[PDB]
Amino acid sequence: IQKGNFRNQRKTVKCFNCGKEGHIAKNCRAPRKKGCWKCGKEGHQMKDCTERQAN
Ligand SMILES: O=C1N/C(=N/N=C2/C(=O)Nc3ccc(S(=O)(=O)O)cc32)S/C1=C\c1ccco1
Ligand SMILES: O=C1N/C(=N/N=C2/C(=O)Nc3ccc(S(=O)(=O)O)cc32)S/C1=C\c1ccco1
Ligand SMILES: [Zn+2]
Numbered sequence: 001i002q003k004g005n006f007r008n009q010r011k012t013v014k015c016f017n018c019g020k021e022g023h024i025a026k027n028c029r030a031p032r033k034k035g036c037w038k039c040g041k042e043g044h045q046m047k048d049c050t051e052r053q054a055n
């Protein structure tokens with residue numbers, strides 16, 4: 001099982017902020033960006049990132 005493109009549950013767990021294994025952004029010690037770790041856009045935290053995509 002996995003939720004992302006990467007092995008974030010499948011054997012390993014992978015951080016969304018810094019991209020390294022063995023932890024999650026809640027447990028991470030790296031500096032936090034001016035935007036979302038889940039889509040990359042500014043002005044929100046990734047739990048407010050609930051809206052649908054479009055084209
Ligand atoms: O509630 C929260 N969930 C979060 N989930 N972040 C993830 C990440 O970096 N890698 C993951 C791999 C697997 C899963 S999963 O558990 O398999 O979906 C989740 C994650 S961060 C957070 C709160 C928080 C507060 C301050 C900083 O972060
Ligand atoms: O409690 C939570 N905090 C979260 N904060 N998200 C952040 C993000 O994406 N980029 C940031 C950059 C700076 C800061 S900061 O505001 O400067 O620390 C926070 C964030 S996510 C979360 C719970 C969660 C559950 C499911 C998905 O996410
Ligand atoms: Zn990290």
Ligand SMILES: [Zn+2]
Nearest residue numbers: 036038039049
């Ligand atoms: Zn987002």
